[PDB]
Design a protein around this motif. Structure first.
Motif, PDB file in Angstrom:
ATOM      1  N   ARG I  26       0.851  -1.179   0.000  1.00 35.58           N
ATOM      2  CA  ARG I  26       0.000   0.000   0.000  1.00 35.58           C
ATOM      3  C   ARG I  26       0.889   1.231   0.000  1.00 35.58           C
ATOM      4  O   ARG I  26       2.091   1.159   0.258  1.00 35.58           O
ATOM      5  N   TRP I  37      -4.459  10.940  -2.654  1.00 35.66           N
ATOM      6  CA  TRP I  37      -5.875  10.792  -2.345  1.00 35.66           C
ATOM      7  C   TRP I  37      -6.691  12.026  -2.670  1.00 35.66           C
ATOM      8  O   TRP I  37      -7.892  11.908  -2.931  1.00 35.66           O
ATOM      9  N   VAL I  38      -6.070  13.202  -2.650  1.00 35.23           N
ATOM     10  CA  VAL I  38      -6.765  14.472  -2.814  1.00 35.23           C
ATOM     11  C   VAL I  38      -5.961  15.266  -3.832  1.00 35.23           C
ATOM     12  O   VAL I  38      -4.992  15.943  -3.475  1.00 35.23           O
TER      13      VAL I  38
ATOM     14  N   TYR K  13      -1.173   1.755  10.411  1.00 35.03           N
ATOM     15  CA  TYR K  13      -1.022   2.574   9.214  1.00 35.03           C
ATOM     16  C   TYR K  13      -1.551   3.984   9.435  1.00 35.03           C
ATOM     17  O   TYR K  13      -0.984   4.954   8.921  1.00 35.03           O
TER      18      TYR K  13
HETATM   19  C1  LIG Z   1      -6.789  17.341   1.734  1.00 32.86           C
HETATM   20  O1  LIG Z   1      -6.829  16.153   2.469  1.00 32.86           O
HETATM   21  C2  LIG Z   1      -7.563  16.243   3.653  1.00 32.86           C
HETATM   22  C3  LIG Z   1      -8.092  14.862   4.027  1.00 32.86           C
HETATM   23  O2  LIG Z   1      -7.137  13.877   3.731  1.00 32.86           O
HETATM   24  C4  LIG Z   1      -7.640  12.572   3.847  1.00 32.86           C
HETATM   25  C5  LIG Z   1      -6.604  11.536   3.417  1.00 32.86           C
HETATM   26  O3  LIG Z   1      -7.208  10.280   3.541  1.00 32.86           O
HETATM   27  C6  LIG Z   1      -6.475   9.191   3.061  1.00 32.86           C
HETATM   28  C7  LIG Z   1      -6.753   8.015   3.997  1.00 32.86           C
HETATM   29  O4  LIG Z   1      -5.816   6.994   3.798  1.00 32.86           O
HETATM   30  C8  LIG Z   1      -6.409   5.722   3.832  1.00 32.86           C
HETATM   31  C9  LIG Z   1      -6.777   5.099   2.654  1.00 32.86           C
HETATM   32  C10 LIG Z   1      -7.367   3.849   2.688  1.00 32.86           C
HETATM   33  C11 LIG Z   1      -7.606   3.200   3.894  1.00 32.86           C
HETATM   34  C12 LIG Z   1      -8.262   1.799   3.893  1.00 32.86           C
HETATM   35  C13 LIG Z   1      -8.564   1.261   5.296  1.00 32.86           C
HETATM   36  C14 LIG Z   1      -9.622   2.052   3.224  1.00 32.86           C
HETATM   37  C15 LIG Z   1      -7.316   0.897   3.055  1.00 32.86           C
HETATM   38  C16 LIG Z   1      -7.400  -0.655   3.069  1.00 32.86           C
HETATM   39  C17 LIG Z   1      -8.777  -1.291   2.840  1.00 32.86           C
HETATM   40  C18 LIG Z   1      -6.539  -1.088   1.878  1.00 32.86           C
HETATM   41  C19 LIG Z   1      -6.717  -1.291   4.284  1.00 32.86           C
HETATM   42  C20 LIG Z   1      -7.226   3.835   5.072  1.00 32.86           C
HETATM   43  C21 LIG Z   1      -6.640   5.091   5.041  1.00 32.86           C
END
Ligand SMILES: COCCOCCOCCOc1ccc(C(C)(C)CC(C)(C)C)cc1
Ligand SMILES: CCCCCCCCCCCCCCCCCC(=O)OC[C@H](COP(=O)([O-])OCC(O)COP(=O)([O-])OC[C@@H](COC(=O)CCCCCCCCCCCCCCCCC)OC(=O)CCCCCCCCCCCCCCCCC)OC(=O)CCCCCCCCCCCCCCCCC
Ligand SMILES: CCCCCCCCCCCCCCCCCC(=O)OC[C@H](COP(=O)([O-])OCC(O)COP(=O)([O-])OC[C@@H](COC(=O)CCCCCCCCCCCCCCCCC)OC(=O)CCCCCCCCCCCCCCCCC)OC(=O)CCCCCCCCCCCCCCCCC
Ligand SMILES: CCCCCCCCCCCCCCCCCC(=O)OC[C@H](COP(=O)([O-])OCC(O)COP(=O)([O-])OC[C@@H](COC(=O)CCCCCCCCCCCCCCCCC)OC(=O)CCCCCCCCCCCCCCCCC)OC(=O)CCCCCCCCCCCCCCCCC
Ligand SMILES: CCCCCCCCCCCCCCCC(=O)OC[C@H](COP(=O)(O)O)OC(=O)CCCCCCCCCCCCCCC
Ligand SMILES: CCCCCCCCCCCCCCCC(=O)OC[C@H](COP(=O)(O)O)OC(=O)CCCCCCCCCCCCCCC
Ligand SMILES: CCCCCCCCCCCCCCCC(=O)OC[C@H](COP(=O)(O)O)OC(=O)CCCCCCCCCCCCCCC
Ligand SMILES: CCCCCCCCCCCCCCCC(=O)OC[C@H](COP(=O)(O)O)OC(=O)CCCCCCCCCCCCCCC
Ligand SMILES: CCCCCCCCCCCCO[C@@H]1O[C@H](CO)[C@@H](O[C@H]2O[C@H](CO)[C@@H](O)[C@H](O)[C@H]2O)[C@H](O)[C@H]1O
Ligand SMILES: CCCCCCCCCCCCO[C@@H]1O[C@H](CO)[C@@H](O[C@H]2O[C@H](CO)[C@@H](O)[C@H](O)[C@H]2O)[C@H](O)[C@H]1O
Ligand SMILES: COCCOCCOCCOc1ccc(C(C)(C)CC(C)(C)C)cc1
Ligand SMILES: COCCOCCOCCOc1ccc(C(C)(C)CC(C)(C)C)cc1
Lengths: 103, 55, 65, 53, 57, 114, 220, 52, 68, 56, 97, 56, 45, 52
Positions: I26, I37-38, K13
């Protein structure tokens, strides 16, 4: 394994003079304020010095406005609230005639 | 008792701001942040080298 | 027969290591909540006195007034 | 048994990993209780072949 | 100048600043102490008692 | 009383200046630029300026920033705001009566206190 | 009413500005620890080293943190706090002043209460009359008819005991005042030069330009 | 003030290897010598912006 | 100016630093790994143009009616 | 004087006793050294008339 | 057979995002908005211009009359006051005491 | 080049106004709204509030 | 302005405390505690 | 002010190879000596153009 780090803040504090230092610092600072700054600055009898341009320059972001007198009217409102809560007579103080320590 | 007078409530608008001079803006130390953010990011992410193959 | 200098855990052995990590990273989490709160507390603030102000904000701490 | 998980690709916390070294975990926790994070001359005295290294 | 003032010598606002700062410091001391040294790992790995046996013959 | 301590190399000073020069060399390494698109206004003599040839380094670091390069410029319009309002104020017409009654930050005004 | 004695406390932005100073200590993680270790091991050797070391670490790192927030995180109190005398006398100087009295306070207190019994210090004190004078008369010196003036003697001997603890207070106050003056006067002079230059350029708009550069001057 | 840095220069010119051990005494020599100038500057600024 | 111990970060012995975890399988999640992600807004830009027009126009309408 | 030099905290005891007994008067004396030369007004001696009140 | 409350990989994580911050990652990322919208540049200019503006207003026109006037004429008079203060004709055009 | 592309992009924008509006409506009713969509909508509302002030 | 940068106007309000009333309530609380506990004169309390 | 450039001159005159490592100290010292003169100048210019 037992540790005061995770099981007793009291014994941790007792076993470390470098934890006593901030507490003594706090106590000394508060005692200094109590002895010197309390009655000279914070008391109502000694609060008008914040309007001085020499000893309190720009405490109100400007020179103090004496025509407005916010301190006077704030404290007058508070004394009026005290008087209304106590139901004291305003004019009872004016009926007093103190004597003099003759001879 | 507790109070909340209306004298503190005043109009606000960015149009009425005097502002800053060029000198005051330079002394505001924003340009130093502008440079040194990238400097420290570069140093941190460049200390850690990845593996490679020499061609 | 068991091996010596070994025993089951007890309450006075303190928390586990993963629990100590969860204790450690709580300030780091509250950082993300408090720094934006710091910026909002500074930005949404208003001064308390002006040249025209006849009153000043008072805060009775113990309700004595 | 701990290294098996590290080989599967699982991330192990530093203190979760320290719990699998119980004898070092205890002495390390006591050094934390005392509050002296310094080190090195103890090594140079217990193992004088490391002195200057 | 503003900082040249007897009012700013015993400022209760800065005394509150110091109070809150060191109360929080006292609260967070046991998290500042939570750094690991690798000296007992070394002692465990490198301490080797004499394992030779006695043989009169 | 007569402890006879050997010299400790850790107490010497033979790495601070080398390390600082390493940091400065890492800084100046990012000032390396190509020939294409190069232009620098020299002085009237023809000699180079001081601040001129050390702008590429700063902006190459601005390139690597993430937030400051998109935030720290929002205080710059305020400079032009001042440039405009100052010129408006240098010649603003005002009432003589109001200027004589309420001068701003004038001395010997008893309404202020002095 | 008569019994109501009212006191006004000036309260401002303290909580949220003081929290982030302690929260930053996890990020800094005592980077000055090695320097202070070196200095403490240069200057003293005892079991109570770690105590005074930790104390100094806390004080110094707080100073550093406040300074960096004063340079970078410019909001409210972080600007004034280094320009104010109360911080330089009580938030940095007082802790360093009381640190040795908190670590070695037992020995210093005992020393002071022994120095109130003032006496001449002899090296290789193999004398017998010195002992008889110290026990019978209390001191090596002649204590005849000093009870006649005991009222001043007590306090004067007290000062005579702390005279060799007084220059520490003096140096702390001196260097705190020095730092306050340095910060205040340098900031004021720099701002004054800036304002005079801006007045010259506002009155001469041929020069009201970023004449050194937007980033050059700021970086410098 | 400039005497200190001149001394540091010529001392390093006599022995470059010692330039690291004297540099503390160089910085130590500046901030102290500079301080009195600041104190001399304090009174003149204490003289005007508070007294009427 | 400063001793070599302060420069190198240790008085006698250099202590080992635990390396950073990777989480195989990951992406890394750090303050600098968030553009994964953003991204910048790219989906509703034309709607942004339209809505800005309509907002300006409706605001101007109601402001003029209020003023009149 | 010979108990001062004894052990068991007797130096602290002797010093604090000397303080509590005589050092307070010494502090007052030091404060009054710059008072003896100064012009002072006459003492407004109490007439001892104010305070009496019958019980009821 | 771990006897402790094993923490999931996803929870680790997420916590790594919070504990893998660096000093510059806090300092610059939070100082840029702070320095820009703070007591130095924007909020300071606003909140310190307001003091001079309303001082001038209460000296020249009055706070009650100013409150009674319209928001437009209020803003105009505030702008004139701001110009008078920025000019500082009495201080020799210098914002010093 | 930009002027030609700026002109030529107007039909695309006017065509995709309705498209983006319909997808936004579908995403709100269906509830299938994600983080990137939320960020774009917040940017949209910021710009809309600015132009509301401007229209005032 | 430089003095404006050397100025701290980040105050919020004035906390007013009647230390006379607070001392009175402290003494009253002490009396209430000693009466509820029915403590004797020789107590450290 | 000139004492710093004179020091740098004699230092390079005794050791040319060290000229590059002492030039930063030279510029630093010139600025500090020059600043005090410049600080003194502020009073003279502040004494006239604002005070009546
Ligand atoms: C501008 O940004 C403000 C908000 O940022 C949010 C960033 O979010 C990213 C989150 O990262 C993650 C992504 C996926 C996951 C999961 C649990 C869905 C991944 C998984 C299923 C592969 C374990 C967890 C955290
Ligand atoms: C020999 C005599 C040597 C004593 C020297 C001395 O100063 O004593 C008085 C000194 C204070 O007396 P005082 O201030 O002059 O009189 C007012 C009362 O304190 C009024 O307060 P009180 O009587 O209502 O409270 C009594 C009790 C109640 O205690 C409790 O309520 C416990 C909770 O104890 C205290 O509160 C401690 C005393 C008061 C606080 C400390 C001293 C104040 C100095 C000036 C202000 C400093 C600010 C400090 C801020 C600290 C951080 C918040 O007391 C102490 O500080 C320590 C007392 C220890 C008693 C031990 C006796 C055991 C013997 C066996
Ligand atoms: C990341 C950032 C990095 C940095 C980048 C740099 C950023 C730059 C930042 C610059 C910010 C500072 C700039 C200064 C603004 C100061 C604002 C302020 O607070 O003070 C208010 C200040 C108050 O002054 P005052 O003492 O009360 O007296 C002003 C009036 O004389 C008497 O007072 P009044 O209240 O009665 O006003 C009368 C009237 C002035 O009386 C007139 O003369 C009427 C004429 C103006 C209206 C003309 C409109 C039609 C324009 C033609 C359209 C052409 C295109 C059509 C298509 C053609 C196709 C071929 O006032 C106005 O109309 C104000 C102008 C507003 C704009 C135009 C009207 C639209 C308002 C509705 C908004 C619509 C939004 C449009 C979309 C925006 C999208 C972004 O008013 C003004 O600012 C107006 C002055 C003119 C604007 C400033 C221009 C700068 C100075 C000279 C030019 C130098 C630059 C030229 C570059 C080339
Ligand atoms: C032009 C000033 C900036 C030029 C260079 C900076 C730049 O463009 O960076 C791109 C920068 C960021 O890129 P973006 O994501 O496309 O921003 C969204 C647009 O602002 C969203 O607005 P838009 O550009 O997509 O369309 C809004 C529309 C709105 O139409 C109207 O109703 C205004 C009617 C005016 C009469 O206005 C116009 O398209 C043209 C009329 C004049 C504006 O956009 C702009 O700054 C240009 C528009 C800013 C207008 C208000 C500025 C205050
Ligand atoms: C106090 C009373 C001490 C009585 C005493 O013997 O006093 C003894 C001391 C003298 O003792 P030494 O000669 O041993 O020094 O007297 C004095 O110092 C003067 C005390 C005042 C006496 C009244 C006049
Ligand atoms: C308000 C929230 C900021 C939105 C920034 C968008 C983003 O993900 O952030 C991405 C942008 C830049 O993206 P790029 O990788 O494309 O340069 O900013 C950053 O990289 C770090 C932002 C840190 C602040 C987080 C809050
Ligand atoms: C109890 C506090 C009562 C209150 O509401 O008080 C609230 C105030 C906050 O009021 P403002 O932020 O509006 O000024 O905070 C305090 O008074 C706490 C002061 C802390 C220092 C003393 C310890
Ligand atoms: C311990 C718990 C005490 C308790 O609960 O006491 C409870 C009482 C209850 O009083 P009320 O019934 O009037 O609310 O609290 C008090 O009377 C005041 C306590 C002091 C609170 C202020 C703290 C700062 C000190 C300044 C006040 C003056 C000094 C008073 C001596 C401390
Ligand atoms: C090696 C150099 C030797 C020469 C030494 C020269 C003296 C240098 C003194 C540096 C210290 C000055 O300290 C610095 O003062 C400036 C000027 O007010 C402050 O700057 C602040 O106030 C100014 C005054 O208008 C505002 O315009 C500015 O936006 C704001 O940042 C800085 O926040 C502070 O850090
Ligand atoms: C130059 C004129 C004379 C004045 C000299 C003193 C100037 C001091 C101010 C500069 C201080 C720099 O402070 C610097 O802090 C960093 C933390 O980031 C320390 O960094 C140290 O600790 C970190 C972790 O904590 C280690 O990973 C690193 O290897 C080590 O260098 C530096 O050792 C120290 O030098
Ligand atoms: C953390 O401390 C490190 C900061 O160091 C900053 C040093 O600042 C000086 C850098 O500015 C310059 C100066 C000159 C030059 C180049 C112009 C060396 C000369 C060149 C490229 C023509 C050879 C580049 C950058
Ligand atoms: C001449 O130097 C001017 C640059 O000064 C900029 C001030 O920046 C404030 C602190 O900036 C940092 C941030 C992080 C660090 C590191 C990366 C070394 C932190 C650490 C030790 C935790 C890894 C060092 C300095």
């Amino acid at each position: 394994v037992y540790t005061n780090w995770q099981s007793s803040y009291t014994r941790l504090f007792v076993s470390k003079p470098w934890m006593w230092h901030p507490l003594a610092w706090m106590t000394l600072s508060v005692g200094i304020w109590w002895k010197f700054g309390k009655e000279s600055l914070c008391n109502e009898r000694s609060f008008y010095i914040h309007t001085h341009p020499k000893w309190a320059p720009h405490k109100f972001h400007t020179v103090y406005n004496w025509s407005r007198d916010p301190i006077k009217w704030t404290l007058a409102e508070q004394y009026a609230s005290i008087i209304r809560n106590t139901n004291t007579d305003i004019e009872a103080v004016l009926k007093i005639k103190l004597p003099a320590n003759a001879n | 008792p507790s109070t909340s007078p209306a004298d503190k409530d005043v109009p606000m608008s960015i149009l009425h701001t005097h502002g800053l001079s060029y000198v005051n803006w330079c002394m505001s130390l924003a340009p130093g942040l502008l440079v040194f953010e990238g400097f420290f990011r570069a140093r941190y992410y460049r200390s850690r080298v990845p593996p490679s193959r020499t061609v | 027969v068991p091996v010596a200098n070994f025993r089951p855990k007890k309450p006075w052995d303190g928390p586990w290591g993963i629990q100590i990590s969860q204790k450690k990273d709580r300030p780091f989490i509250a950082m993300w909540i408090l720094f934006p709160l710091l910026l909002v507390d500074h930005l949404t603030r208003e001064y308390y006195a002006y040249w025209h102000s006849s009153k000043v904000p008072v805060t009775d701490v113990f309700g004595d007034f | 048994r701990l290294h098996e998980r590290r080989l599967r690709g699982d991330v192990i916390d530093e203190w979760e990993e320290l719990d699998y070294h119980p004898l070092v975990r205890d002495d390390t926790y006591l050094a934390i209780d005392f509050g002296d994070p310094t080190f090195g001359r103890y090594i140079w005295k217990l193992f004088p072949h490391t002195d200057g290294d | 100048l503003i900082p040249v003032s007897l009012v700013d010598l015993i400022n209760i606002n800065i005394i509150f600043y110091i109070l809150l700062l060191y109360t929080l410091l006292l609260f967070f001391i046991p998290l500042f102490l939570a750094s690991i040294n690798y000296t007992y790992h070394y002692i465990y790995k490198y301490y080797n008692y004499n394992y030779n046996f006695i043989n009169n013959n | 009383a007569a402890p006879a301590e050997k010299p400790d190399p850790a107490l010497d000073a033979t790495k601070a200046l080398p390390k600082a020069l390493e940091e400065v060399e890492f800084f100046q390494s990012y000032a390396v630029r190509r020939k294409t698109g190069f232009h620098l206004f020299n002085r009237a003599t023809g000699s180079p300026t001081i601040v001129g040839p050390m702008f590429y380094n700063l902006y190459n670091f601005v390139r690597i920033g993430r937030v400051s390069k998109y935030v720290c410029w929002l205080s710059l319009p305020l400079v032009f705001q001042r440039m405009w309002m100052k010129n408006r104020a240098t010649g603003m017409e005002y009432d003589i009566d109001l200027e004589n009654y309420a001068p701003f930050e004038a001395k010997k005004n008893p309404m202020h206190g002095h | 009413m008569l019994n109501s004695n009212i006191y006004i406390i000036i309260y401002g932005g303290i909580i949220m500005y003081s929290i982030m100073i302690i929260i930053q200590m996890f990020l800094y993680n005592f980077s000055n620890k090695i320097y202070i270790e070196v200095e403490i091991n240069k200057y003293i050797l005892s079991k109570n080293n770690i105590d005074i070391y930790w104390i100094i670490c806390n004080c110094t790192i707080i100073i550093i943190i406040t300074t960096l927030n004063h340079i970078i995180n410019k909001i409210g109190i972080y600007n004034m706090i280094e320009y104010n005398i109360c911080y330089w006398l009580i938030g940095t100087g007082l802790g360093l002043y009381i640190s040795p009295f908190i670590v070695f306070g037992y020995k210093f207190f005992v020393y002071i209460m022994d120095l109130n019994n003032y006496s001449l210090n002899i090296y290789h004190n193999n004398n017998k009359m010195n002992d008889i004078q110290q026990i019978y008369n209390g001191t090596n010196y002649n204590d005849t008819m000093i009870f006649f003036i005991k009222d001043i003697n007590n306090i004067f001997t007290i000062y005579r005991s702390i005279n060799f603890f007084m220059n520490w207070l003096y140096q702390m106050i001196y260097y705190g005042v020095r730092m306050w003056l340095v910060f205040v006067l340098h900031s004021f002079s720099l701002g004054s030069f800036g304002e005079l230059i801006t007045v010259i350029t506002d009155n001469n708009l041929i020069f009201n330009v970023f004449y050194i550069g937007l980033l050059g001057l700021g970086f410098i | 003030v400039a005497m200190c840095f001149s001394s540091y220069m010529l001392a390093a010119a006599r022995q470059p290897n010692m330039s690291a051990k004297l540099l503390p005494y160089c910085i130590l020599g500046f901030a102290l010598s500079e301080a009195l100038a600041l104190f001399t500057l304090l009174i003149a600024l204490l003289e005007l912006f508070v007294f009427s | 100016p400063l001793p070599n111990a302060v420069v190198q970060g240790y008085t006698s012995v250099r202590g080992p630093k635990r390396p950073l975890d990777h989480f195989y399988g990951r992406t890394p999640l750090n303050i600098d790994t968030l553009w994964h992600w953003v991204k910048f807004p790219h989906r509703y830009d034309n709607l942004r143009f339209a809505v800005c027009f309509w907002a300006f126009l409706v605001s101007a309408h109601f402001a003029n009616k209020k003023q009149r | 004087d010979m108990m001062k030099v004894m052990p068991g905290g007797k130096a602290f005891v002797g010093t604090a006793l000397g303080l509590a007994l005589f050092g307070g008067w010494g502090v007052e004396f030091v404060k009054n050294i710059s008072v003896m030369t100064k012009e002072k007004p006459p003492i407004d001696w109490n007439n001892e008339k104010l305070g009496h009140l019958t019980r009821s | 057979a771990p006897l402790y409350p094993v923490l999931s990989q996803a929870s680790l994580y997420k916590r790594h995002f919070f504990k893998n911050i660096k000093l510059f990652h806090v300092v610059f990322y939070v100082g840029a908005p702070c320095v820009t919208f703070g007591t130095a540049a924007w909020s300071g200019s606003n909140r310190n211009s307001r003091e001079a503006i309303f001082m001038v207003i209460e000296e020249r026109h009055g706070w009650d009359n100013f409150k009674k006037l319209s928001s437009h004429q209020q803003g105009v008079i505030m702008q004139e006051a701001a110009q008078e203060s920025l000019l500082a004709r009495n201080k020799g055009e210098l914002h010093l005491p | 080049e930009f002027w030609q592309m700026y002109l030529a992009c107007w039909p695309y924008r006017f065509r995709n106004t309705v498209v983006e509006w319909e997808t936004c409506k579908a995403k709100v009713l269906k509830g299938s709204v994600d983080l990137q969509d939320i960020v774009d909508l917040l940017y949209l509302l910021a710009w809309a509030y600015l132009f509301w002030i401007l229209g005032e | 302005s430089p003095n404006e940068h050397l100025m701290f106007f980040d105050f919020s309000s004035w906390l007013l405390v009647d230390f006379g009333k607070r001392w009175e309530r402290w003494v009253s609380f002490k009396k209430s505690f000693l009466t509820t506990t029915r403590s004797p004169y020789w107590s450290p309390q």
